[PDB]
Paper text:
The switch from the destructive to the recombinogenic mode is triggered during [name] translocation along DNA by recognition of a specific octameric ssDNA sequence called Chi (crossover hotspot instigator; 5′-GCTGGTGG-3′). Here, we present biochemical and structural analysis of two phage proteins, [name] and Abc2, which target the DNA break resection complex [name].
There was structural heterogeneity only within the [name] protein, suggesting that the [name] conformation becomes uncoupled to the rest of the complex when bound to [name]. The structure reveals that [name] adopts a parallel coiled-coil architecture in which the N-termini are slightly braced apart by a short anti-parallel beta-sheet. Many aspartate and glutamate residues are displayed on the outer surface of this exceptionally negatively charged protein (pI = 4.0). The phage protein engages [name] in a position which overlaps extensively with the DNA binding site and also with the binding site for the DNA mimic protein Gam. The C-terminal end of the coiled-coil binds to the extended [name] arm domain, while the N-terminus binds closer to the [name] core, making contacts with both the [name] and [name] subunits and helping to explain the reduced efficacy of inhibition by purified [name] retaining an N-terminal tag. The overall structures of [name] when bound to either DNA or [name] are almost identical, although small rigid body domain movements help accommodate differences in the dimensions of the two ligands.
Author numbering:
A (entry chain D): 2 to 358
B (entry chain C): 511 to 1121
C (entry chain B): 149 to 984
D (entry chain P), E (entry chain Q): 1 to 49
Amino acid sequence: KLQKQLLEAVEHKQLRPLDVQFALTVAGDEHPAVTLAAALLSHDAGEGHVCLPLSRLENNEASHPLLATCVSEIGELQNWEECLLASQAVSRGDEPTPMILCGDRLYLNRMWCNERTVARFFNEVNHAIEVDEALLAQTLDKLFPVSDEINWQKVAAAVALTRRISVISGGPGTGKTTTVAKLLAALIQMADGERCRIRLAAPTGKAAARLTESLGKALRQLPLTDEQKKRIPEDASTLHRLLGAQPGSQRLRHHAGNPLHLDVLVVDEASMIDLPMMSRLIDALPDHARVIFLGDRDQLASVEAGAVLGDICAYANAGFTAERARQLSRLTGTHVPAGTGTEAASLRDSLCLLQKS
Amino acid sequence: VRELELPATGQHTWRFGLTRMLLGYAMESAQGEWQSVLPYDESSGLIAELVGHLASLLMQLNIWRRGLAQERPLEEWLPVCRDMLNAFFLPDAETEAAMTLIEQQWQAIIAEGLGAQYGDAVPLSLLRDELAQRLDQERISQRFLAGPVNICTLMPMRSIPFKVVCLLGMNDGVYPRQLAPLGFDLMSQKPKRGDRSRRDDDRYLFLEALISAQQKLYISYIGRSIQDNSERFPSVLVQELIDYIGQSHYLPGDEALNCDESEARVKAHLTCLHTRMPFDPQNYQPGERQSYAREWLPAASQAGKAHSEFVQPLPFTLPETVPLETLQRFWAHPVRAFFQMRLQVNFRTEDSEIPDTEPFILEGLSRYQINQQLLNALVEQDDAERLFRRFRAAGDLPYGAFGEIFWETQCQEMQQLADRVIACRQPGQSMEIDLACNGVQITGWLPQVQPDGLLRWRPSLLSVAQGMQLWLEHLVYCASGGNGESRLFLRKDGEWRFPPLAAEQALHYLSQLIEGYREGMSAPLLVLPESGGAWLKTCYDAQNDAMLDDDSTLQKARTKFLQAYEGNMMVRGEGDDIWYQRLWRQLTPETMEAIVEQSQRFLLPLFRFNQ
Amino acid sequence: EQQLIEDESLLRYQACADFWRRHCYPLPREIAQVVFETWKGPQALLRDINRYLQGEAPVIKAPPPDDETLASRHAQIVARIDTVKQQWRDAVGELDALIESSGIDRRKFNRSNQAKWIDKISAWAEEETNSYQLPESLEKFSQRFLEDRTKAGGETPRHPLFEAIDQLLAEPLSIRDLVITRALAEIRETVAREKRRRGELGFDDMLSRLDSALRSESGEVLAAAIRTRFPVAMIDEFQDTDPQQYRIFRRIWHHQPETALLLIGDPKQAIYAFRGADIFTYMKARSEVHAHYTLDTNWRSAPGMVNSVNKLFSQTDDAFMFREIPFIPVKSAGKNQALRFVFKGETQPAMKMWLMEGESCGVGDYQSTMAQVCAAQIRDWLQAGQRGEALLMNGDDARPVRASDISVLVRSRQEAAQVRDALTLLEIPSVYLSNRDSVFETLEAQEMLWLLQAVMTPERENTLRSALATSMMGLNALDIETLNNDEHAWDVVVEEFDGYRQIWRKRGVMPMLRALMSARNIAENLLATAGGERRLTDILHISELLQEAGTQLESEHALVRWLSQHILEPDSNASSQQMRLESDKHLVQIVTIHKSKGLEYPLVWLPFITNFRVQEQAFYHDRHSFEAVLDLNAAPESVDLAEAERLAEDLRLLYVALTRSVWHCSLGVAPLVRRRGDKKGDTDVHQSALGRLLQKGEPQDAAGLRTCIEALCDDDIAWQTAQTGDNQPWQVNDVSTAELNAKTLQRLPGDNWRVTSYSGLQQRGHGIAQDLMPRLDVDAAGVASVVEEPTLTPHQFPRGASPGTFLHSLFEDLDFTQPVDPNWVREKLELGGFES
Amino acid sequence: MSRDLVTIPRDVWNDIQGYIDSLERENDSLKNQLMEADEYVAELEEKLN
Amino acid sequence: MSRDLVTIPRDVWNDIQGYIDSLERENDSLKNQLMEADEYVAELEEKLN
């Protein structure tokens, strides 16, 4: 009887046909509530949301019209989780299943894999890079003339150089491109004899050309040697072109088996980087590549459903750890504030916010 | 499947495929099989919406085939047709007329059935055949006198005066149209005045068309067969007409002659035999049958240029950076690489027809991929039963015991192969390759490089193409800087082994490889990996490191070269290929000598350094 | 009322697949192993029985019992092997001692070799009997083998186990025959059931139904009615008859008063065995009739040409190796006594044979040399004809030898190509005629398929660039590179192909191909290229066929699928798919022996008449019963009879090929050996039809063949050695071409006058909707969503053209004065199909 | 290499391939038998001595 | 359908014929050698017994 209501909801454009077909094929034998939850999860995945919380399944003042109509069929459930666990479709990840019940949320297998990949990458894949502090201090002093006060750009450059993966957060017109230019200029001066390969990427070609022009204008400001000028990247390209996305299929050229031929990577406007593209970009990178992300926390693309940077920069408000505060104080030659409490070391130590416009 | 009285395998069905594609949208294929079905990776993302629509289509069909199966009274069959039209079709301005016609015929059939008060059950096939026959019986004549020229069949009792009346298809046996009586018709046995037969109807239609022509009458028939150039005869009516015309009239200046000669001469004067092809020059001459179609005039004038040779020299410039995969793909098949890479020409159909039945055996790439995966699983000592269950969930393996026998034989062979690979395997890591040869930069990745050397295993028969690929990899490895020995194991105890080489010599040989790639990008290289390989293996002496020039050695080399080129009944041979056929239709000893020279030049180090 | 289907190959393959699914799937692994060893798949099984599925079912020698099953046969074979193994396991020690005691030469039977065999048999015996395969040493340990190697005058080793091995190895153990018989029966039943369900019929099915009806109890009244329908029946071409046809003809007309059955035929010209015609049917019919008549006058050929054949076929007592086919000498017409062929002022013999030098000769070298010699001789004939030295003379009248007179007869399509190339080397145009060919096998079909696939989707670059690179288009690599480099020309070509697709959608298939050929000058460049006329004719035929097919198809993509399906599997028996004549000009004609039957030619050349082929299949006819017998075991006794029938068919083909010549016939003969074991060994010419007549069925050598040829020669028959002719091309004088101009239309026909309606005058979108339904409510079009109706209000009534027509029909027949009747409205709604 | 080209039917070409392949199999068989014979006579000589 | 005719250079065709003659000669030589071996092994055996 639930199938007829699903078809009726499809006729009124309340639910997509793909969602209803998926629900019928997966949870046909299972409880009607399980089928309705699978259909709602497919609809949310079509909208672009990462997960469906079980609280949304519970009847509320604002809810899907179909859920209210199917209330009689589902009746009353004391716990949504216990009923779902019993179904063959939903599991906790121990066995391969189409849907995963993680905590209070429901995920698709592909979305759960991407979330786990991003979390594991930000937590443990990052490895600290120990370099000479005197050379770095001299280069930063050459980059930044004012050393009397704490400079957020100098701290951002120090964090980006001391850590593999890092994010420089800041609003438009706050001097992010100038900071990236100083970072690249310092990185080139750090290792002159060794081969350096810097790559630039952006989600859109418009932002790619904007980044190329701005980085050129910011790099021609400070004098560099010929060998240091050779290391400067020539141009940027679209992120889809960098991974070699085929027009017909979804397969990529630079998959996990074939890593990218780059050492340093910069990704401008990381706010438009959704979860699938981030999870696919993580796999292509090798273990020796340091990556830097550009964007702002308050941008709408960061807080949109499926984004990553919005939840990453959310912990930047806590501040740096106590030990990294002293480390950055010894590096930048100023007093770096320390954040209260300990929530996440590897995540908070790879973030920086530019509050000067 | 069970209704078709066939064993229900539970796979290779529409439901199975839909469940597979939806599981692919839900779950990644790397996870495994859920409820014995492997998810399908391709159906993912926004494009996956299409899958849903497809399911809806099937969701309709399975609904109707169940309902149409049961037999119902005539009264119940009325709402069906209409309900069947709105569910499957979105009607446009032109389609609504045909839909209304179908509904009208269906309603008329069921009304004629209900008029007699037939109460017994009626199957669907009866009404279906009745509908199919009535659709054939009905004809359209709404544009008979619309204003353009009328082209229709001869209808009885319809005689309208026309200035020009033409008749086509008057061959013997085609006209008059014949209809035989049932055989139990009492009227046909005893003819009576006023009876109507189709034969007499057509025999009188011919006279009606004769007398209806006001100004001009035209008659045409097929006198000669186009295939065999054999004589065909016209209808009896046209024959009687031409005989009467010949007997009645005589051509001027034929008064002296007798009646038969004059008749023959007159009948010859009215019959006009046209050409067999439209591009025949005889049509484009001043006369009665001069054509108005200047489309074939150029062909008749025979003024044209012959097709030149397809291959032409092209100026090519090497880019600064060339990937290693590019060089490997080029040296895989240079003759094909010229067409596929330089000209971007792929002689393949855009859509490949789906196999009619489920696979009962595995051949070609379907077997090769499974063998490669099984070998990769056995080299690392992984469980073969899990891979077997995965392939079973995929559905590639045959049903029942046949798939088990295939898997057992393949497991035995791959285990025998991997027993050698396990012994000479050491842990390693892939290193990025960046090299500069003659001003060209090569960037690549070499998987599973170990300090002992380069180890590769492929489940295929021994061939010189694998040796060329291994030699390219070995040159890249040695030029990058490292001490190692290259080893490649193949099917049936085949091994390609290369010792460590110096960096300078590796650069020297890679320079020749890059020059060969550059020459191939300009003009199609005449290098054959297999035929030239046999020629070198026969000519080259491994002990003395020299090319034998003995007449018997040369004769054996030519014999083996032609054997590897043309092949046996079982093996198509290297010569049989679309790309090779595109170059030359037939072999030439000049082409043979050029191929021998280039293949020797490019493949001599392979047999020289092979151990 | 029934329909007709041309092809049943798909039904045969589907029935075979269904039989495989039904039988092989429930088999256990132990039996599935043997089933897979015998056949890889259902298609491999169909490949064996496809010949026997068509036509009348053949009788199987030694048929397996019906009650027997596959598992029972497997258990029986396993029990036999187990008995043999158990006997060997007990006799593994006394054999060694017995062998030493036995007086058998050990030179044949080495102790070390014996030790190897003993160990090999012992290892095989110990292993579980999973499969039927047996070791080679069991053959060495057979009683008969031991009795052969045993020296005479001494004790012969004799054990019960040795006797058992001989009994076992006497007949091969397998399950093929049972599966073959069951598959034949099941596939025939399934195909018949499917065709009965669909209601369709076939050409063979009509004969089968008529035969089954005549044989049934109702057959008597049917035969009486048919006999009353036709009092006299005359059957022409009776040599090519089937058992069912003769059974029918006998049923209706045997021993019937006031009826006549005239069977006219020629047994010496029965060469259609591949179609299913049976000569043994004619042999059975000949014995049943006691009245035989013959025609003793030949009106076609010259007296010398008839005398040569009569002398050639009178050497042996039984020329056609069959007692039921006697040879009667025929006379010559009095009017044809004056005919003669004269070359260079000297009369030539009627029959001339060319002999190739050498003690032994291969097949390929023989064919090449004979093709070259035939080309040289044809060139010499043509040159002598043009100069006028060679003439064909009837009485005093003489005519020059033109190109239309000469003809070459070959047995296969591949040979024909070799003779065509040999003639092309000398610049002599030729035209090939055959009876079994399909236009879909040609490359032109594949190129047309690629062009259609490109036109259907011009937006995709890969398909359009692949179709442009076809040889039919005529574009080199330079043009392809120029088109790839420039985007503007590529976009122009894409727009052109889009226009082609529009023409395809609007006017049809052939109107698009016509414009495509006219725009790119395909026909002109094809006719300019050597050999392009055949390609152009094939293209035009394929275009006509594509038009005929797309006329009866639902969508445009359906036509591409139909073309691809016809290309993948082509039919040669179909008359429509037969390749047309290449050219209508008078050229040298290459015609197959089967097609040449019933035709006459002035000069005939047979370059490869000596070449023969041995058949391996064991399918024959009983000499006494005259019934087709198939031997599944394939015993040599059946292969010998099959070879004899093959040789008789070759003799008939040779007679048919020889009788065609009117004036002169030339044959190429040479000592042919399949595989030379020894130089002193006899040649395989005796197996050939011509060699058997030349050597009287006695194997000899090259010298013996030459001596027999010399002895046969007379005034009519002459022989000359074959040597390569001078490789000089035939020079043909140039011909002037008059100017050719097509007519022009000064006046253009006007489409102003037309009969129109308001809907057609105003509404263009309707199209042909007015033609289908003259009274269709075309005012309302573009139906919308009428899924649900809350209160069934008149506004919620279904909207469209059909509901509007229903509403109009309601008011059409309604009576205005009387009040509305609810039952009438209910009946109208029920008839219309709407809900109650 | 002589300019002259020789034409052979596709069916004709096969038989030579089978024949040459058959000769090689017979040759390989002859080699092993000869080696066994040589091994056997040498072994008997050692036993005799 | 273009695979009906096979074109080989005249020198190449002659070499194939030559290779076949040499294989036949080798076969004949192997035949005689084997016969000689079997004849020798029989005499040796008789001496042992």
